[PDB]
Design a protein around this ligand. Structure first.
Ligand code: MG
Lengths: 72, 188, 208, 206, 50, 218
RNA sequence: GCCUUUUUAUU
């Protein structure tokens, strides 16, 4: 998007933000994973950051979503 | 749905190639890179749009960050391919979050020559100007005051402004050119 | 071939408020997006009819430097807020307006009287036996040449145009004209550019 | 010509060898862009007349055009020190490195944050700054000249003829190896234009 | 000597003259210095340096 | 709210022409004067050379035997050539010039619809008597400006579809007629001569009014 | 299909 200052206040560290957004982008590319955000015509780079703008995607709650996919 | 006929579609340059292209480059980060990088700000990412002419339109606000004027300097450009490298360009290498310099507390985004010159001609005080000593309802009315041409850009008037930190209002001595700035600055 | 030109689709028509609006005309011809925005800019600021106050008459106040007693308002603020009044009249051109207030309290545009066809669409902003005259005017007049207030005759407050590149899959560097505007609310901002369209069209019926 | 110049500007063209300088003065008889003849006067002659073959649209060292245009009319007498034909970027003996445009030292809505130039469409229209770049595409044939690959730009000889509007990415000179695989050269993208002349030297184009 | 040369032509003695804007149509409050300054195209072209 | 009328057209020559726009209101003379100035330079129907096909010489750089002016500067004189067509957008014109004498624009054979308003325009100069030139001048009608990049012997040139060259407008004082806020606007047009200056303001106002119909749609 | 020197030129 325009700026990333709203997504960095939810996680803190900037390099932890790239790790959680890359794993969110891998699920949106190969294994489906339709996002909870309203889908627009932008690419998956902005969708990986728009989910952290309100705080529905974090580095702690993405690992429990990977284990939820492994149980199914 | 192949690799052989897709090369023929690119080299033919028909109408359907550019509509595919603007979807890819709508929000793709692209690293603009000077060939001498003696500073950290020599590599900055951008979200480009498709234009005519084979030259890159490097932003003037980051022109002082590159420490390189538009003197005909030929310099590189780079893209990240994968999505874990594109997020490195948007969260770290973008020109939006590169405001402050790593060297000092002053920002590296400093208006150097022309945009500061347009700001300096507005923020000035002149006597015997067109429309000297008139009231204005707000800062947005100064755009109406200047574009019609009945008043000068620099005239000692009293404009109403709304300052924030919650909103306070006072009638202070403010010229016509400084009243253009109040619609530009944020609230706080 | 020479008479056919690009017509905009008028897709992005958004309004952040009832007064402020940002429209987008895309696509346009190269070199046309600046001249279609600048000509309709000066029409809305200098060549359009409107309604505003003309003269202020306060009891005991004949100069611009005075102080009112009994109310929590000054002279320099009482003619400034009245300049940006969202006043509109359609039946007659010149109309008078009165204001009656008693006691200690704030004055606004809600408790005032209409006195006929005068309509007030913004009663929330802050503005005694004060009589003012509201007449029809074109554009904007100053208070320096009238030698007793400047009249904000045009209903719009600010209009700026920006032009970016547009793509029509056959040509390049075409103009994409956006227009941000904010008015007093007497007319609609979608109708404000439409009113400037009929003003410019009435000047071209003798040529066409 | 430069609207503001120096008195040295008349001396660079008459001292350069790429600008045609007449060895003997006199009137002219036939003024062409290919060659100009000068009728030698009775005092300048020793007979006959001299000839001056003007190099028209030849390749320079930096892949740039060099052409010698005439500056005198028919029946115009010249002296020994005069110029009969201006060289490249020259007119009437004055060195014209560029063109005098109406320069306004002011910014216009951007485009002048640094010392870059905002130019008119009139400059693009009247060809006031468009130049000619003549690139060389040499063909080392160690390798037959026939273009039998396993087009319209050839004259059935494997060599492109004079005046073909080539495009970046087509075959220019056919060169196959005796084996049959195609390993010839092509024109790169972005230099699409017409051919001045195809110099074949050591078979119909030769 | 240049200001004396400007008195010969129809244009005034001052080096900067008032003129209108292209996309706006308004006369500048500060006159700019127009003129036929000699410019030249270099060898570094964008068709070869891209 | 006053409709301007073309009440007077003063032409000192076929190149430079001046029209009058009266009556206009105050604040609208700079508005309508700038809006008509931009569109006249943006897109107007002008006739210029698009393709040249010369017998003998194939491409646009090879010099021809028997001429004086270079063949690349011949196309510059063809770009300065002002022609006007009436009913057909594609026309074919020929030179067929033989003998001594400079090649002028009046030597070009024109049809009943093709009219050259500048007969003193010199294309090139011929110094050889027996040598002659003959080209196929192809002129298209369009607007704006197109490059030469966008038929071996038919050499491609760039076409400049701009029938005007410079537009001069200024706001002057008009007559009163018992009304204030009234000013005079004149427009001086230095044209190539293809379009009528009375029709130059009229056709530029048609494409201005057609672009304002989308402003009615919003 | 390249590589290395040398020269010119650019920031
Ligand atoms: Mg530099």
């Amino acid at each position: 998007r325009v700026t990333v200052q709203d997504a960095v206040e939810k996680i803190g560290n900037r390099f932890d933000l790239v790790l959680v957004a890359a794993r969110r982008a891998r699920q949106m590319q190969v294994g489906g994973k339709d996002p909870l955000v309203p889908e627009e015509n932008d690419k998956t780079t902005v969708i990986a950051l728009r989910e952290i703008e309100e705080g529905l995607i974090n580095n702690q709650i993405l690992d429990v979503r990977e284990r939820q996919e492994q149980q199914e | 749905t192949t690799i052989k006929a897709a090369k023929k579609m690119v080299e033919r340059e028909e109408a359907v190639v550019w509509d595919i292209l603007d979807e890819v480059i709508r929000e793709h980060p692209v690293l603009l890179n000077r060939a001498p990088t003696l500073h950290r700000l020599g590599i900055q990412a951008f979200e480009p749009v498709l234009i005519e002419g084979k030259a890159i339109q490097l932003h003037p606000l980051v022109c002082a960050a590159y420490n390189a004027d538009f003197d005909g300097d030929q310099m590189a450009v780079h893209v990240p391919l994968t999505l874990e490298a594109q997020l490195e360009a948007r969260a770290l290498m973008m020109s939006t979050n590169n405001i402050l310099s790593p060297a000092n507390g002053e920002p590296i985004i400093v208006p150097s020559q022309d945009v500061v010159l347009g700001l300096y001609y507005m923020t000035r005080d002149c006597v015997n100007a067109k429309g000297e000593g008139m009231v204005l309802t707000g800062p947005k009315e100064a755009e109406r005051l200047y574009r019609s041409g009945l008043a000068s850009l620099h005239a000692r008037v009293k404009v109403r402004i709304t300052e924030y930190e919650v909103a306070k209002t006072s009638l202070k001595d403010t010229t016509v050119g400084r009243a253009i700035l109040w619609m530009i600055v944020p609230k706080g | 071939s020479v008479t056919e030109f690009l017509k905009p689709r008028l897709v992005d028509i958004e309004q952040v408020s009832s007064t402020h609006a940002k429209v987008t005309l895309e696509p346009l011809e190269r070199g046309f997006g600046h001249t279609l925005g600048n000509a309709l800019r000066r029409i809305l600021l200098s060549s359009m009819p409107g309604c505003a106050v003309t003269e202020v008459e306060i009891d005991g106040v004949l100069h611009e430097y005075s102080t009112k007693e009994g109310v929590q308002e000054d002279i320099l603020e009482i003619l400034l807020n009245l300049k940006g009044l969202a006043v509109r009249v359609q039946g007659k051109d010149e109309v008078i307006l009165t204001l009656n207030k008693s006691g200690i309290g704030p004055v606004t545009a809600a408790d005032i009287t209409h006195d006929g066809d005068v309509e007030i669409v913004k009663p929330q902003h802050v503005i005694i036996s004060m009589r003012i005259k509201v007449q029809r005017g074109r554009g904007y007049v100053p208070a320096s040449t009238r030698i007793l207030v400047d009249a904000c005759y045009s209903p719009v407050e600010r209009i700026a145009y920006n032009v970016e590149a547009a793509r029509v899959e056959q040509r390049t560097d075409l103009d994409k004209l956006v227009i941000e505007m904010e008015t007093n609310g007497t007319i609609d901002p979608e109708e404000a550019i439409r009113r400037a369209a009929t003003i410019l069209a009435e000047q071209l019926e003798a040529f066409v | 010509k430069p609207l503001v110049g120096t008195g040295m500007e008349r001396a660079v063209a008459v001292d350069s060898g790429v600008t045609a300088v007449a060895k003997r003065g006199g009137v002219v008889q036939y003024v062409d862009a290919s060659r100009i003849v000068i009728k030698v006067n009775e005092d300048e002659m020793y007979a006959g007349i001299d000839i001056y073959n003007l190099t028209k649209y030849t390749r320079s060292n930096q892949n740039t055009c060099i052409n010698q245009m005439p500056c005198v009319s028919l029946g115009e007498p010249v002296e020994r020190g005069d110029v009969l034909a201006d060289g490249p970027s020259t007119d009437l003996g004055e060195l014209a490195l560029g063109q005098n445009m109406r320069v306004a030292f002011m910014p216009w809505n951007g485009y002048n944050f640094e010392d870059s130039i905002l130019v008119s469409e009139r400059v693009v229209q009247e060809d006031r700054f468009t130049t000619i770049h003549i690139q060389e595409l040499a063909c080392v044939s160690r390798e037959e000249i026939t273009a039998d690959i396993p087009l319209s730009k050839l004259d059935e000889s494997g060599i492109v003829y004079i005046g073909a509007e080539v495009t970046g990415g087509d075959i220019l000179v056919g060169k196959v190896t005796p084996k049959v695989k195609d390993s010839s050269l092509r024109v790169p993208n972005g230099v699409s234009g017409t051919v001045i002349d195809v110099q074949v030297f050591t078979d119909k184009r030769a | 000597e240049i200001k004396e040369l400007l008195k010969l032509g129809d244009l005034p003695t001052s080096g900067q003259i008032r003129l209108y804007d292209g996309r706006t149509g308004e006369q500048f409050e500060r006159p700019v210095t127009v003129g036929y300054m000699y410019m030249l195209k270099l060898n570094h072209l964008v068709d070869d340096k891209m």
